[PDB]
């Protein structure tokens, strides 16, 4: 029923900051809808990087955070570094199912 | 060092069922949930379902019901997942990955999927 919608792909440059986002077809989402970011690094390799949205991954740089802004779910990367080059994928957790949403192409060094 | 193992692949004539199996180490299994996930490009994930080690209890995606089994075998540490009639479409990437039902909400360790070519 309800559909996640995300930047298709955002483009950045080395040292700089960047933030990601992520909408609910619902509502405002906020800290109940438990927004994970995946972090997918070419070649089909999975990593969760933040969960119960500020809640960093172990092992995961600094320069990475989740929060809410606004009425959506959030991603901040800070002096992004190539290695950070990967699709960012959002989910959240309505009633009785997760909702992937559509992934962001984080192009690093653009 | 958590990890989660897939075997890599299946190839199968259509209409053809198959069980797909997870195995996980380095932590303890029946703490955490397992979750199934499918990907295939257009943006691909969604979300098979979920079993509950302890329960053997599931909750799945109502797209997915006539189709998968979740099932577990506690003793090796294995989650499955069976499909039943692969019609086609299927053709796609069958990821396990860890959840804390229990926890800091994320999923975690994923397992390096098993692919599905009809
Ligand atoms: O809610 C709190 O008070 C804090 C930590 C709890 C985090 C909430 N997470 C959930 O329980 C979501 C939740 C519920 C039912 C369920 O079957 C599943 N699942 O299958 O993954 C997740």
């Known amino acids: 029923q309800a559909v996640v919608t995300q930047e298709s792909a955002l483009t950045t440059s080395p040292g700089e900051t960047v933030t990601l986002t992520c909408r609910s077809s619902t509502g405002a989402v906020t800290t109940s809808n438990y927004a994970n970011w995946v972090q997918e690094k070419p070649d089909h390799l999975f990593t969760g990087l933040i969960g119960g949205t500020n809640n960093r991954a172990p092992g995961v740089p600094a320069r990475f955070s989740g929060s809410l802004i606004g009425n959506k779910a959030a991603l901040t990367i800070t002096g992004a570094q190539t290695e950070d080059e990967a699709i960012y994928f959002c989910?959240?957790?309505?009633?009785?199912?997760?909702?992937f949403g559509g992934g962001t192409k984080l192009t690093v060094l653009e | 060092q958590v990890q989660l193992q897939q075997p890599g692949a299946e190839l199968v004539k259509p209409g053809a069922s198959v069980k797909l199996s997870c195995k996980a180490s380095?932590?303890?299994?029946?703490?955490?949930?397992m979750h199934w996930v499918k990907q295939r490009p257009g943006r691909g994930l969604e979300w098979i379902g979920r079993?509950?080690?302890?329960?053997?209890?599931?909750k799945y995606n109502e797209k997915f019901k006539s189709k998968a089994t979740l099932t577990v075998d506690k003793p090796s540490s294995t989650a499955y997942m069976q499909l039943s009639s692969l019609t086609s479409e299927d053709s796609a990437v069958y990821y396990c990955?860890?959840?804390?039902?229990?926890?800091?909400?994320?999923?975690?360790?994923w397992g390096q999927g098993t692919t599905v070519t009809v």
């Open positions: 079993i509950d080690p302890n329960s053997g209890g599931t």
């Open positions: 989910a959240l957790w309505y009633s009785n199912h997760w909702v």
């Open positions: 990955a860890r959840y804390d039902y229990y926890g800091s909400s994320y999923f975690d360790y």
């Open positions: 380095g932590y303890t299994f029946t703490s955490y949930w």
